[model samples]
Target: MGTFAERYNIVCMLGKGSFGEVLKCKDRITQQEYAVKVINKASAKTSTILREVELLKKLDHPNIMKLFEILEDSSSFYIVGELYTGGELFDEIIKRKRFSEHDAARIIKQVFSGITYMHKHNIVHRDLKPENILLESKEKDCDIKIIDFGLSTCFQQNTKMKDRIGTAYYIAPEVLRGTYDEKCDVWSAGVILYILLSGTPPFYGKNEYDILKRVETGKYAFDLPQWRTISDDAKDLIRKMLTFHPSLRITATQCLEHPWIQKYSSETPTISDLPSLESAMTNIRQFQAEKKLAQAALLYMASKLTTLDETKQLTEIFRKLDTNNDGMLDRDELVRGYHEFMRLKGVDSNSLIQGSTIEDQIDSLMPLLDMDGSGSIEYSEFIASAIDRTILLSRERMERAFKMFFNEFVEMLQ
Candidate 1:
């Protein structure tokens, strides 16, 4: 019954652990690479590995490690996932010659997003230390993926999670002392963010008890010389991120919403994450032609619209172009995007809108599209202009928008 070798063409060992070593292997059929962890079911660690497999099976996000296949035999379990060779996270952090505020935000933003997704599904990553974070590759612009869900769990909202779990340096004070929630992850993220900036853990001492002693009090400072160069806003975010009270801890969604995420993350190169501009240009022009009333309607639609891929894309672009970080882009900021960011991308914007010149095209859209007639365009304004037509104007969406906003559809639940 033990025929694991026949299915996988093992390249070499990746990591050897108490359970079993991970192998750099490829499936016989697909021949695609995977990091396969072999777990001994008879060992005391069986249940923890089993739980990780269950959690990995359901989670599929870009920022989290992906599970490709799961195989089990009489006494061994084979957990297969996307092969990652980028190695330890903070080790890579030091290799970066130290992280700037922007560098740290880029990493922490994805962590915030992925953790938000996990917590939304009611899962808590109880052990989210630097060791569990890894880069997809060693390249400078390569993305990071959160790994090792061994201590993570699917939790309940009404229940108080009382696991005194987590590594000493990175654990939430509430977690080590006992009662916690999904927000335990928030404290761990704050520790990660702290290390990224100070290049040191928020709480650390010579031994385990020493580290745990400092962590229990939930007190740390930016007295280090490295922190002197960091901003008050960043320190402010860290304060909320590691809030001592589980109820008061900043959530992953709130971490994402924090002004620090925008002010710092967008400063990194990110536009390539959005889809191509061929249809995006068409939407821009279509928005440019709408009459004032229809334009206003579209703004209303965008404001109340639920989640969509196109909305996230527009959000990133609008946030990137919004240099002042006031959540709105004015004429100067719009023009700033055009000259510095947009024109440089060569998206054919000069011909996309109705204008003889690039500036004229942007100018023409400004007044018509800024539905409120403010000096600048707000987030909803950009979403309405940039949204994909198939989804934005579909009948399903129109009726849903009608139901969500208009009072005529207030019928019974049935």
Candidate 2:
């Protein structure tokens, strides 16, 4: 790739993460503004970055954040993405006096819409707090964009993931116990809904321990003035979502189809625009940047933890890439395998490949992919390059790719 500084003029620093920094930048040619996350390859968190890239690729919805392109050099990975001008869901709530039923309904509807898409593809957003949700603009009716997938994972039907991960207040009961499925996301959404309506989390205490205890019991009530004006349908939905039993908790599809969410689209008028409210562009820039910093710190720490079972399909992809079944891939094998892989994935290489031939593209990228100059690519190098692009593979595919190399390393050490 070319120099990131030459391609885009850095406007200001948005935020700094453990392994990277996010900057507000403008494209040199189009002058279009974008957020660029610059990650250092030397941090030893390439696998974590790959995991995030893999998840973001599967998501293609109006409410999900989009990855525009990835620019890289010898030292860092520059991830260019669509910049959501509106601030975090948390800051939006803090600025508003009180959210109308119509307002909260509208936001939750978009939230569930994105979540439903994710679930349909068997991806679970392990972290779904307000900080991860961003408004596209300051306009009352602007779409909400779900940001940050650092903790997300993909799983098959009926599979359970054991990872005690998520923010304290929004975390589901099952997550605290370290075993849960996609339903955990439903619980977090319910917490967000509660905060939207009441301006306070449903489960709150003096300390983290006390807060978690409340979450474990799943005991919360819609007390006083907060519930008085709120519709029964809305309260009913939250109750179902916050249910102690994951199986009983409503799914994202159910949330989308619920009467409360439908009521906003069918009956309520749009809330008047708040012209006096804080500008979305300013609020989101600082808020999202700080949140990005936190995510980076957590990601680095979480790297040491064992991931739940990954997908088997990635091994199959590797096998296909290893055309000769010699357990490794040379540049020629990679070019041929990549061409076939794209065809299988329904990608129109003619339009998307950009080069005169697939071989040309491979030749151009080989210098970047060949980390140690071994003349051949191993499984780890194969995965590192595959996930570096904006297009997504299944999380299972990315995770399995990492696991294969990890296992091989373990075997070698023995």
Candidate 3:
């Protein structure tokens, strides 16, 4: 086949990098859109594209970009992935006047949140510049997704690794000096925070070596004219996060408690330890708001129709619908559950609770399910809703209500 198109349909190109070109293509059978990072083995002699692919397989987190599937032929390798349409954050910053202190804090929080998840798994993303970060365009929050693991390395319990990787501007000094560890990521974060607030990097020289020299010497103007407008809390955070010495660097958890974070923290909603249906709805809405019309329309249309009432009735009817009692909803069950819930909560010719319809009751149940403020239901949530008596309902009632309720859906489909 010529250039992989003959064997696999090459829909369009996503990006071109040192190792290979990433394409946005459709699976012939599934018809699902996926990012295909195709590596021509003959052309990628210098980079460890295969090794990077293997490392990525072990990770699973929402904040961290994920690798879903892989396909390979005699001459090429295809990395099938979720399409993040928001594009690159680097371009966003370049396009804007500058990121506000509030905006900067938001970005830093997400970065640290992802890093904390990685540290738990012992994976350090060696490269974490803006270009490697992409915004998930489909969601309302438009949160950043950490991408590119080509230079990532894993550490065992107390085990350290030494690898001089990442772009020059964002690299930690210890990494530059040839001595580094997981703390190197913390340093890079500092660099990112500094650049975000000040609208300029801390160190600048006519050439790469000169910039390195400035960074090594710690020559910077924290008191520059533009910096005056930045909050003291922001300045203090940049100070602590960007310390030259890795050992002296503030830990990620400690950074979370910083004044800048505390000041801007009000933006994130207060969520309980356990999420409620309202919380999940709020979360979904936040993510949905960030996307463009077309992408948002797709997610909205594909969303399950199950209402909160159906979610409340989850337990009694759950065992029957589960078919496997795995305590998790499979694709079929999820669809069925959503439809069933929508039917129970579906309003007819008459309104039910005074000003509230069955749909309003469904909306009301969200706050009960969304425990954590981050906005979306976790697997634990589905379980939590199953046992609460006041919120819970019997399967018989749910089934009876649902059977009559699904008629409208059937009519709509026909």
Winning candidate number (TM-score): 1
Q: Candidates sorted by lDDT, descending order?
A: 1, 2, 3
Off by over 4 Å in 3: 1-8, 41-55, 138-140, 150-166, 267-414
lDDT of candidate 1 over 183-263, digit per residue (tens): 889999999999888878888888777888899888898889998899988999999988888898778888887988877
Q: How do the residues 51-166 of candidate 3 rate in per-residue lDDT, one tens digit apiece?
A: 66665754534357766545666776676666788887777778774788888887777787677657755677766777788887744456577887643231111112222232
Give one digit per residue, the lDDT tens place, for model 2 in 165-238. Answer: 23689999989789658999999999999988888888998877888989989899988576898888989999
Comparison by TM-score, 1 against 3, better one: 1
Q: On TM-score, who's better, 2 or 3?
A: 3
Q: Judging by lDDT, tell me the better candidate of 1 and 3.
A: 1
User: Candidate 3: deviation at residue 132, Å?
Assistant: 0.9
lDDT of 1 at 99: 88
Candidate closest to the true structure, highest lDDT: 1
Model 3: worst 10 consecutive residues (lDDT sum):
154-163
Could you give the candidate ranking by TM-score, starting with the highest? 1, 3, 2
